[PDB]
């Protein structure tokens with residue numbers, strides 16, 4: 001039932017998911033002059049050399065590129081995190097126009113899209129157990145702006161017309177997610193939640209400062225995707241982002257400056 005339209009969008013989620021109005025909801029605006037540099041943050045460690053992608057899936061909300069997480073191959077560690085988090089999937093949120101689409105904002109600036117690389121805390125044994133825990137997930141968020149093409153994204157863009165509609169999937173092996181990272185790993189971090197229902201408060205957010213650039217043609221192909229299933233009226237998959245939520249009793253920490 002939930003979605004992104006007038007009738008079922010973010011303003012409505014709280015009726016099914018009361019936690020929508022809870023104390024640690026995501027996304028948030030990152031006020032760069034209030035975030036404080038934290039010298040105790042350990043360097044971040046993104047180890048994706050052994051990452052094994054399997055499949056790409058249009059889930060009716062976004063598209064997910066899924067990884068094999070049945071052993072410790074592609075992990076995120078360090079930074080604010082204790083222990084080892086395993087990459088399970090990534091997806092994006094994007095807009096109908098280049099001036100909107102990201103979930104986090106930076107001094108109220110919206111980017112054209114935001115990539116979320118989702119990882120679960122291996123001390124909880126499976127991701128379904130991890131989402132029930134306040135430190136169960138670590139999501140690495142990366143902003144996209146429109147400018148020069150991102151070569152490492154083109155394999156994703158290419159396969160999208162084979163998963164145009166809700167519930168379609170395609171084989172998607174040997175994709176290397178290192179090709180989606182910016183040069184710097186400087187980041188902001190704060191405790192928050194999944195940004196779609198069920199809005200669980202189980203996420204350590206790590207949001208990179210440096211956006212990646214993608215081309216206008218690349219982002220245009222995201223906007224050709226459909227929210228609907230095959231044989232249903234076409235509703236373009238655009239604007240699948242939740243707006244910034246209240247920061248409440250949280251501090252956003254910077255890894256830099």
Ligand SMILES: NS(=O)(=O)c1c(F)c(F)c(S(=O)(=O)CCO)c(NC2CCCCCCC2)c1F
Pocket residue numbers: 059088089116118120127128131139193194195196197198199
């Ligand atoms: N935008 S996000 O990174 O916070 C997000 C959600 F908001 C979210 F609700 C989900 S979901 O699976 O709970 C509902 C449909 O996507 C996922 N998916 C991943 C994280 C949640 C469970 C851990 C396994 C990987 C799926 C998810 F990645």
Ligand SMILES: [Zn+2]
Pocket residue numbers: 091092093116195
């Ligand atoms: Zn997301």
